[PDB]
Amino acid sequence: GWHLRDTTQVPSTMKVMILDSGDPNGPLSRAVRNQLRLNGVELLDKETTRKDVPSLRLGKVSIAKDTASVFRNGQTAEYQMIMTVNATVLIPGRDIYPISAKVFRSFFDNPQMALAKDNEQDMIVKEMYDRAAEQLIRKLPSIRAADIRS
Amino acid sequence: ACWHWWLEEDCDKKECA
Amino acid sequence: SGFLIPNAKYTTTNYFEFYLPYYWNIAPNMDATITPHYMHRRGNIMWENEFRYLSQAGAGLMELDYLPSDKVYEDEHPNDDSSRRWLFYWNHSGVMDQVWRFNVDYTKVSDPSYFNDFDNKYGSSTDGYATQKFSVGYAVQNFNATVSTKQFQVFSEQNTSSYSAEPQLDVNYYQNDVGPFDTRIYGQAVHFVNTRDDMPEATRVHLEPTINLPLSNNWGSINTEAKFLATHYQQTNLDWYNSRNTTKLDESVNRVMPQFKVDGKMVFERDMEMLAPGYTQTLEPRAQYLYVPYRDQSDIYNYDSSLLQSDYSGLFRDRTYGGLDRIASANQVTTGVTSRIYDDAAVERFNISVGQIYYFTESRTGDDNITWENDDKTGSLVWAGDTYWRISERWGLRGGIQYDTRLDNVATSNSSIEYRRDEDRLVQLNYHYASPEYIQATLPKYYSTAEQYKNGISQVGAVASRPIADRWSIVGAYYYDTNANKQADSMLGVQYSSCCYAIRVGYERKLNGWDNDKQHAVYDNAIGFNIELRGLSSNYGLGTQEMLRSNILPYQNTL
Ligand SMILES: CCCCCCCCCCCCO[C@@H]1O[C@H](CO)[C@@H](O[C@H]2O[C@H](CO)[C@@H](O)[C@H](O)[C@H]2O)[C@H](O)[C@H]1O
Ligand SMILES: CCCCCCCCCCCCO[C@@H]1O[C@H](CO)[C@@H](O[C@H]2O[C@H](CO)[C@@H](O)[C@H](O)[C@H]2O)[C@H](O)[C@H]1O
Ligand SMILES: CCCCCCCCCCCCO[C@@H]1O[C@H](CO)[C@@H](O[C@H]2O[C@H](CO)[C@@H](O)[C@H](O)[C@H]2O)[C@H](O)[C@H]1O
Ligand SMILES: *CC(=O)N1CN(C(=O)C*)CN(C(=O)C*)C1
């Protein structure tokens, strides 16, 4: 009994919204702005004249790179990269709803082509923000469920 | 010699200079 | 500003050692810590200076360790002029006026065996190299430009030559309203220089103009992206490489090459009632055609390109290798599918993802130094699959499998299950595997030759932490390698926390090194105690996560 998605990924009360962050020119804000641009969502400037418009406040970014496996000599084999993103949605009559997004990535270390490997790591960083932005989109309408149950 | 910039594939060097 | 509580530990490398902190406030936003480290086997005092600052350029930490003399480094290195040891560390991060970004990540050691001998605070014994990065960038909403310097120092004594970017300039410009098309351009100017003087140097200039047309509906989306790659190499110091290899690098290389990519994402829903009412299952297909023409990169040295690991979201990339030296040809389609299960409150509980790449032609780049166990070139060669299940609010499991047909084996796999009541009560089991075929493929030849690398990875790890009576915290961790039937890591920690003081006792047995004479691994032990003062703030934690980071294989939370 499958059927096409007749609804929208972003809820209809969040079709126009305000993107707020402590670093608007960062890669996270660019990824979130791109991911709201692909869903047809109109974004307003910060401190606009339009009231009862819901808002996205992006919090802080935790990026960790740690050792996940070692070889028989104890040198690293796997690098686990961790991204933790916090955000709050302000529905300006109702409530502040906090959401988070945590991204797991994984790559081998090779010292002998290590600069190559670090450019690899930069590319992984360029992916993870985008994936983190998608998870924020995937936590939009549960708040809409929380907009009904309250 | 025999340089490509568009979608044509490069070919092997022992028949072309 | 004054003396802290001095604290001691006993390791097999340094025997009995102790720290005597002294803390100093220079001005508020600037503090420092000067610590004598008396070590008994090395028979001297390492001076450890930490200096933390917060300014308009951002927040930074500087570290300077100096050991003036060493008996042990005089023993196994008698021919050197001095046995001094030193560490310099600098970590700076900041954004000034929302447009200026400054990042410094600097780590320089005296000798490549430093972190196997001393404490692991800003480096690790697991680390195979030390990083020295500076980066200054200007970023506004449609334009960023970052200059950077990346130098590395390699610890392994097989080949200490490593390339460095001195400097590297990255320019990105974006414009998303040119008709229905979105345009962007990326430029890069990078100078590659190596530590050895007989190795060839280069200057790369790269331009990448890109247009794409996205279309979307309520149920699907399609994205067509056309891209150019223009690359100029100027290569010098070419005599020593051309004096001993059959292929020849050229001093001036031009490489202009297209890229065509079509992506399509498809969404179906279903109300699933046989599990619970109100639950929603979404089935998401995704397809991708990618065409990259073949250009011959045998006349280009591999400076900054490494082979990328291909997970499920890594299946859908337009690059086979990272960097810009090696760009493989592509005539491929990537097909993946993701099933998601949402609860009645539209919260995602389950997802599973499985996909594959079909290659119509061989992904070739001009040279093929990676070995394979068979000659499979076209067809369904790379398969990937991820899963995440949130069983309850306390349980969770993750899994990932990556298979390559050219390896004739599963390439990599990982799994984890975690029970977590709160910050203090947790059990985690995890498993990691990498096949030795993939070690033979993606890592160089002495890794497949030497016995400490050639067996691959198969480890089982168990982490646990439990409080007693809201004042005692007991932390354990055990990581075991099943290929050699030998352990990699052990960690224990008991912490008593009071209203104004806290005592923590930590134990760790770790893999640290390898004995090249007798051909077996080297383990070291560490038992120690820490006393810290509470009551000055609202820190009434039991210190569980600070004990969980204390080993060479850290805890990370997987819900
Ligand atoms: C980021 C910007 C990149 C700009 C670099 C690419 C620009 C496009 C190439 C046009 C360069 C003008 O150069 C002109 O054309 C070709 C193509 O390189 C050169 O031909 C070249 O072919 C190859 C390089 O791939 C080498 O064997 C050799 O360096 C040269 O013979 C000609 O000797 C020159 O007459
Ligand atoms: C569908 C997508 C979701 C799937 C989620 C991922 C699940 C991963 C399960 C965790 C991994 C279990 O580990 C899996 O089994 C064994 C080891 O036990 C490995 O198997 C390999 O090694 C063993 C012995 O060492 C031999 O049988 C053989 O050489 C090879 O098959 C697999 O390559 C690995 O994938
Ligand atoms: C779910 C979490 C579980 C938490 C519990 C796991 C952690 C418990 C601690 C495990 C560590 C004890 O493990 C044990 O360590 C001792 C330390 O003397 C090792 O003993 C060692 O002694 C000396 C080192 O001083 C070496 O010369 C010798 O070769 C080696 O055997 C044992 O080989 C190992 O079996
Ligand atoms: C210059 C060039 O592209 N070609 C096409 N050929 C290939 O084999 C790829 C035929 N050819 C030569 O053999 C020299 C010329």
Residue numbers in the entry:
A (entry chain B): 1000 to 1149
B (entry chain C): 1 to 17
C (entry chain A): 226 to 784
Paper text:
LPS biogenesis systems are essential in most Gram-negative bacteria, with LptDE responsible for the delivery of LPS to the outer leaflet of the OM. These β-strands are connected by turns on the periplasmic side and extended loops on the extracellular face that fold over the lumen of the barrel and require rearrangement to allow LPS molecules to reach the external surface. LptE is tightly bound in the LptD β-barrel.
All five imaged molecules (Compounds 1–5) in this epitope had an aligned sequence contacting the β-barrel of SfLptD, with a ubiquitous W×(D/EE) motif making a consistent interaction. The remaining residues of the five Bicycle molecules aligned poorly, especially in the regions facing the detergent micelle.
